[PDB]
Amino acid sequence: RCDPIRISMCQNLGYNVTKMPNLVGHELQTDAELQLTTFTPLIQYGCSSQLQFFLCSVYVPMCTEKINIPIGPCGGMCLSVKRRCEPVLKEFGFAWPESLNCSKFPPQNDHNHMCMEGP
Numbered sequence: 001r002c003d004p005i006r007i008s009m010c011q012n013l014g015y016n017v018t019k020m021p022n023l024v025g026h027e028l029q030t031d032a033e034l035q036l037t038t039f040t041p042l043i044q045y046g047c048s049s050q051l052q053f054f055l056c057s058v059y060v061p062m063c064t065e066k067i068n069i070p071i072g073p074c075g076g077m078c079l080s081v082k083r084r085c086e087p088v089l090k091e092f093g094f095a096w097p098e099s100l101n102c103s104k105f106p107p108q109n110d111h112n113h114m115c116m117e118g119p
């Protein structure tokens with residue numbers, strides 16, 4: 001069964017229940033929340049209107065009682081967010097992390113693939 005989302009920046013999305021471990025390995029939401037501080041400067045810069053949803057869908061993926069795998073982002077949204085936000089990371093000498101490699105996510109939502117295409 002699913003657990004409430006405790007990460008404040010991941011409230012008020014279309015869903016509000018999750019199930020750890022997330023798509024980046026964290027068993028604890030608080031650990032996900034600390035790691036997310038890595039991105040708060042991008043979040044207030046505002047490189048992408050989708051960054052918030054995207055990060056949340058990875059760090060606290062959607063959970064339903066009816067489906068027994070976590071539901072993360074589709075690759076389309078990942079690519080769109082990366083294209084807007086990686087250049088800002090690059091200005092400061094950083095790069096889009098392997099942990100957020102868009103190839104890890106299903107390319108689109110399907111019969112075969114379940115994922116959130118987001119806002």
Ligand SMILES: *[C@@H]1O[C@H](CO)[C@@H](O)[C@H](O)[C@H]1NC(C)=O
Pocket residue numbers: 101102103104
């Ligand atoms: C992302 O993953 C693929 C293999 O899954 C790899 O070829 C690629 O170089 C990785 N990194 C990217 C695209 O930056």
